[PDB]
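CORE FACILITY INTAKE
Project code: CF-77B
Contact: R.S. (postdoc)
Sample description: multi-component assembly, four entities in total
Requested service: structural model of the whole complex
Turnaround: standard
Below are the sequence entries exactly as provided by the requester. Do not edit them.
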Amino acid sequence: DDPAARFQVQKHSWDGLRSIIHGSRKYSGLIVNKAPHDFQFVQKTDESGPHSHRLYYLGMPYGSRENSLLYSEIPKKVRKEALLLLSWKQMLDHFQAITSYDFHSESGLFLFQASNSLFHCRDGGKNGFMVSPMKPLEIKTQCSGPRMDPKICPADPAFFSFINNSDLWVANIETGEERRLTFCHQGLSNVLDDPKSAGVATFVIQEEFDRFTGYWWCPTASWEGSEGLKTLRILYEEVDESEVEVIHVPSPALEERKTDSYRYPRTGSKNPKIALKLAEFQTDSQGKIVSTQEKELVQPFSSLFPKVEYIARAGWTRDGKYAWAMFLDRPQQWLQLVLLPPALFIPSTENEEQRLASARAVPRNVQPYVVYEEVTNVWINVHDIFYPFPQSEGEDELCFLRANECKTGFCHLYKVTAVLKSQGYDWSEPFSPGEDEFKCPIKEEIALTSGEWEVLARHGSKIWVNEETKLVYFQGTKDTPLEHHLYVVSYEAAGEIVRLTTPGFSHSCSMSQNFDMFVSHYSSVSTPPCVHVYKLSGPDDDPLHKQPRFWASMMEAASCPPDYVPPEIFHFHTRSDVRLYGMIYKPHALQPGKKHPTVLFVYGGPQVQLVNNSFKGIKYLRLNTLASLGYAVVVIDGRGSCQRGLRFEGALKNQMGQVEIEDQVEGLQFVAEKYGFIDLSRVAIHGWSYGGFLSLMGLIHKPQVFKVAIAGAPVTVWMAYDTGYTERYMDVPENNQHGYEAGSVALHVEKLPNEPNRLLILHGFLDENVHFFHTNFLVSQLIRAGKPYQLQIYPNERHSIRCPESGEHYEVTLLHFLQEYL
Amino acid sequence: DDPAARFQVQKHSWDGLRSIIHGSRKYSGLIVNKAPHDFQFVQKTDESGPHSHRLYYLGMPYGSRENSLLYSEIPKKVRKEALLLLSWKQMLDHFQATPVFGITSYDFHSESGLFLFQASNSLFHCRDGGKNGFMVSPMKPLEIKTQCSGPRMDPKICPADPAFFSFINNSDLWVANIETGEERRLTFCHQGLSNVLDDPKSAGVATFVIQEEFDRFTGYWWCPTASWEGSEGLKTLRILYEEVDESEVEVIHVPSPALEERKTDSYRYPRTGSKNPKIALKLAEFQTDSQGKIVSTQEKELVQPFSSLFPKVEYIARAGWTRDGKYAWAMFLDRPQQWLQLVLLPPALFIPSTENEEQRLASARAVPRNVQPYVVYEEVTNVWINVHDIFYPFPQSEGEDELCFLRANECKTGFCHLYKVTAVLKSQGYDWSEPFSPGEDEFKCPIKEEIALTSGEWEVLARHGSKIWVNEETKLVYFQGTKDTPLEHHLYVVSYEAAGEIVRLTTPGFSHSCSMSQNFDMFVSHYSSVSTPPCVHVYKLSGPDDDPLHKQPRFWASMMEAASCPPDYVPPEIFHFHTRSDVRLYGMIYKPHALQPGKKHPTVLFVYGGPQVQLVNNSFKGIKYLRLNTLASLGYAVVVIDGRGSCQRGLRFEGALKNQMGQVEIEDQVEGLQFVAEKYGFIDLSRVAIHGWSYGGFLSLMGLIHKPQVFKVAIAGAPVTVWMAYDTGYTERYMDVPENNQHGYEAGSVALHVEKLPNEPNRLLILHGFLDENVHFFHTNFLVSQLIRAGKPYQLQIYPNERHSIRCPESGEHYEVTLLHFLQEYL
Amino acid sequence: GNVDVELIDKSTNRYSVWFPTAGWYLWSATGLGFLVRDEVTVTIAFGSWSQHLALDLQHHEQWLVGGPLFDVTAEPEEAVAEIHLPHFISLQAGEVDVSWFLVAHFKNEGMVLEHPARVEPFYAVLESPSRIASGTRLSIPITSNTLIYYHPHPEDIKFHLYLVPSDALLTKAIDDEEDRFHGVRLQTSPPMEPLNFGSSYIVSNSANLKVMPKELKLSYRSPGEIQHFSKFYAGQMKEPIQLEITEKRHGTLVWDTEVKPVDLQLVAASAP
Amino acid sequence: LIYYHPHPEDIKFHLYLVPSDALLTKAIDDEEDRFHGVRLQTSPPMEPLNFGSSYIVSNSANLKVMPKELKLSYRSPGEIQHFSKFYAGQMKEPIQLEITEKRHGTLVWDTEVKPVDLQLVAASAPP
């Protein structure tokens, strides 16, 4: 068309491009300071000192790169006209490290993991609040191997527990005594010969149902009353990974040329064989493990609970009466909440007469109560929101809160009251449960919130239920889907929804246990992320309307890059009239009347929202580098994205890969008409794993619009991807061959361009999530169809490019490829 | 700078380039037909029929996808001014021998006329030319049933008794019988309970490093004669085999061909520094009644452990037996591979094998004092021993000592030459019950004489399945050699009594792959020149019998005419030149098609450069390097150089890469480029591409590192990026030991010199087959890794289904179109 | 003059012929000149080049097979002294050499190739045969296969079917046994053959020929090609449709690579 | 990779309402034609021969028999394999279902950019 109205990107040398990327990240530690998290408020209880609480969090004190436990001192009196900024007071004595620390409020116990071993310390209990740093004690072990997943006992601070060699262990602080409780794993050979695990979360549960534990302490202490023995239960998940396909993936040590076996469940193939189990033990007052005991259900788990495939979540009620668990079916449309009272679990032995003996011994009234049953036509998202109440009066009628997206289409909190009516079962004689056996009837299911917005439940968000003020604090997108705000509501009555966070920003919040202060990690598109401490303040007659007043600030919004312009948020409508949001980075030093080439960055897949009013500079700095080189950068979250409703997300059901790219092209065409700097002849599509899969679908089904396609780590065959993700959306491969073939992009290589330099495939070699086989099979079918490609390997990178050198190479390769061939 | 005299290659589209590669490969399926091989002459001995012999061989007759066993009929008389072209008759009637494909190799026993071969997941046999007559129409081959499960690898017929044969099944030696159908295991060392990571004992199999760097594909050898223990009527039948334990050798996982399953295969891969597998020689005997049924069996082992009787012996290169059966010979070799020595092990030296250490002492007492192993020959060198499998011992029916053998010896004069060596077997007398440490040379025999049958500045072909043929009644030895010129392989004959003149039997101006009759009256030669494609002619030694040395080879008949070149094929030109050290190097060049004087065309320096491969010779290159001609037809000068380090020029020539490999050969390639640049006038020095496969890609990367000013681009295919990861047999042989030669390992490990690669992009394209068992994908992975770490650009191409050579045509076609595109845009 | 035949079986097409005395004895029904010197009881059978050649030399680009294949058996020892044997390839000085000619013999041994002595403008001489399957024709050029340059003879048929004349034009090199086999293969929709020869100029191997009607009907399968094969296969036929009973037809065989045509006829409907 | 001479043929049989064709793409060794014909003599056709394959096909031959318009088409890739005198031929059995005058087809390779046979058939003379 017009060559005088098309911006020419300046051809830099490779070392020039490195100089540009380095100049972008010559202040990288100031950008990603790993802003604090896992906040823990503890009260002082003196009414004479200056500080009311101590706030605990993770950070670097700028003396080392390692993340470490820190604290702040929140004063009870604060003065006006003060941007109060607090130093990060450092806890330990500077030794070589701690992440995902566990805390127990009563004794003030801090048990953590640091790179080889477990450590602990205690502050704020019956001892004094420290100011000078002390040495946190090392726990000496007899076990051979790393000791993973540690948790403190809530009932007794002296005891804790961990996984060692894929078996549940339990220990004690003062005596040093460790003791194994599970004996399904021997370590005689590799995982192929030793397939039984206990108390750890398996692969697909860990990486798609977002649970990283397979054991849950009982929060209370039971007394069998032999003489004085205090029982302490743990619910854990036994897993038999015998019937699940094993895949070999290269180890990080490339020199050794060795792999690791991975029990990877493909779709269609069998998931691990699950079961719930009680691992008990008892203790004297001296702190000695008198006895231990594996415990098991009166029936087999598979027979007591037919058609169950996944333990989404589990835990216990606060009083300890029932152990709850979210079950989930293989199509992932049939989630159910279940209560497992500890008497439902008989002892375990090889002796079938001892088994019958305690099957007779278990009462008749005790049974599992299916309290809630979410059934849907699209898919269940695992919402880890389940707050049950004490039923200490009227010993029935369980009252809980539950997020339920399947009812109305949007994730909203509800108060649900079920009634536990015992049917009476002879647990010695077996039986087959039907379809509606253990489901308790509901008294009522009041919806505390309703609307065209969601309550945040996934991604480690949670609700906070204040029991004395009768209030529940939750997060939501009620103002707009682009901004996470802290809201509060009453659960006895559907009152008004009160926002606590400032508008115009997006917030990650965390409440105090005493419910008087919260933290908010917040940001905007323009401002960097800050971490402010707010204070609920007002009359107690209306605690719902208690006003959050800014109390103190932890970190201020950091240094913007000197070449950072904030991107512009927009929205638009499709032909079907659904509102889609998008971002754009404009080219630096824009000259009106010039059409710049446009990089459509994309992920597009579920469970991820790209476009929101939150800071992008922390890990979308590369997008700013493209903009500063002169590329228009467009980003669209089409239908199938997170946090816009179940019906919205469900447009990709059994046809994922087909509707998202249509939304991205329409987003391009909108930005082209609205603005005047989009060169449609020079369009690049680019993204990582889902983004690369879509980039390949873009170049396949809309080649005339996308000039090039930089597909990083793409998923090319859905038959090879794992169950939890793929089956949820693409129901069963036996029942959906049309959509498996249509969305398996590697089977459509014939539609790729015959002309070269239009397709760049990037892949990390050690990728646990979307394995190198996908790129290999793509390159295979490209070879067989006679189509060109470029390709780049990252041999030391799993899924996200974590090494700065590897990210710098990735970006200089991206700039060069766009520079030359877009 | 000056574009008036620079040829610009016409930039084709990708589909255009595919159209060009297909137009190249219309006749590529015709130019190679898997030309016939593994010839076996058998006489007719009829005196009234028309055929003098029947020639048996492997072939695909171009009418089928499969390679199969075939035959031709060699007549008693053909006339001059004629040209007889043989029909290729079948013995196997039009079935499929595959689930190259078909029957890869076969075994033959002359007296019974038994053809035992391997085909599609089972064993087969047939018979032709014993007391049974020579058939005309083919029959079905009889399949040999088994009760044992698994594949039956490497079968061999017993020469002493043709009814019996043997094979490997599940890495253990088995033995069977054709007519009765009975089989029996002989070694019970590999239980097969689990993976090779937990079951490391093997028997009769060649390991990885022995199979792929010493070119031995078997680990068991039948005894050619049957001893008689004489209990009542029992016929003993021995087999020498090598027991091998692979417990302390590193295991590597390499991806399996079935990419969907995402499973690997474990490989007992000995890298340099690590321990090679623990070897031993062993006798598996058994006995037979007159009716032909096995009765007893027996594993036997040496009176001392093998490692103690033969200290510092690391590899069994070869082994077999003397023709009388009196000794089992074996060529041993040290871990530096500079200390080869041949040893004879008489069967009485092997006592039975039992866990009962008193039975062990009992038969240690039972073995006589006189018997011992006699080290007849000891080749020691300062460069490395190239293992030459040329032995052939002579019968010694008078005076039962004084062993006379033939032996190829390159370390002596620098060139591989035959010798007749007569050593004397003097027994020292050993009490084999007492354990002891042998001295350095205590089994070494003194030599009576060592006459040299050939000598000069040329060498005898010994490796790569070449061999000598020793007619003992006319007392002549037929060998192949490079006596006329290093570029050609000619059949020569000489006498081993009177080492006089060496008579060439093949026509000059060609290179020949030959194979004699067992009765030495006619041979085959599959030959070719650079211009003429390969033909397979049958020549006939003919003349007065009183002077057998000068029997004139007259052309008798022809098997195939030269399956010709494409019309887009011009033959390349061979040249030679001298270096600054005044060493003569040879090279080829493909000139640009439609060459005009004045224009400087871009030049692709194709290269391998490593040892054991001679790129330039007077043999047809179009059957394997058609891509070089395609490059030429697009207008690239294609240069091919054999620098110092290439084979077929002697030990001193090959040894210029000793402990510094990568540094001197590339210098020779650069010098060859500069020679072609002054002599011709179409070499553009500003546009030079270096290109090659595995050693060639390693050198291409050395070219771009240490000579970046000359090589504009570098297409490195399957490169060896770290010598520390490559296996023992190759790397240690040339680059001494890692812990000794750290300076030369670092200097010649290209992945550690990525900082010297160009900062400019589009100058380096790395090709690699993902399933490569030889030069593992780790090498490319570690290279790209260090490129990431040094911040240097690269392009990369994967072949997910290709192991080492690009075998399947779509993948080869993509490889070639990628090569043409890369040169068009970035050279 | 004309000598008799005796057909023993039509399938493998074997003829027994009685030859009275010495003579030249040209038999141009297939093209054999038999210089004989006595009474000869001769037998001529049918051979196909596919089954007897070694399958490499059909697709070989310097092994253009000519001629048809004969299993001739006769009396030896100067009884049948010379066999003048029908080739077709052209006799010009440039690009064709007499020493490129070879005659093969298909023994149970295989293929025996010898140079002939003299080449005649349709024939080549075989000197003193020593016996079956010997009537052959091979050629070894040192130059590629595309330029041996012999021209076919066309054969065209007008046939009345549903009151619509279908034509039938085939263009193959002169092999009378191949001509009669293509005739009996076309006899399912039977032919009638007028006497026309398109032997105007020389056209080479692998030539793409366009069929042009000067006055036009429905033109069909226009890019025909020049190939040669054994005496079974379907030819490069042309079957245009006339749909009426008009008298004159002007057909042209014209090249595409070079502008000059090769062949033009004007054929009447006098006996349809 | 032998380049064998192909056998293309378009048999037609005009049935009472639905005329069924029979597209033979087969290698030939001079015995299978009569046996396959007398197998199909239960529905006795005539042979309307058409443009023979001047260009030559190779081993492992998977081709597309693509009509220019739409027809009754399952099993649309055709394959060329050899078989003895006991098995059915690897061939297409279409039914063109009406009385349209003409039909036009082509034979196209997989990795190539070129066709190999351009066939035409007219239904003006139904047997």
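Facility notes:
- Chain A touches chain D through two residues (CB under 8 Å).
- The first helix of chain A runs from residue 14 to 24.
Invoice: internal transfer
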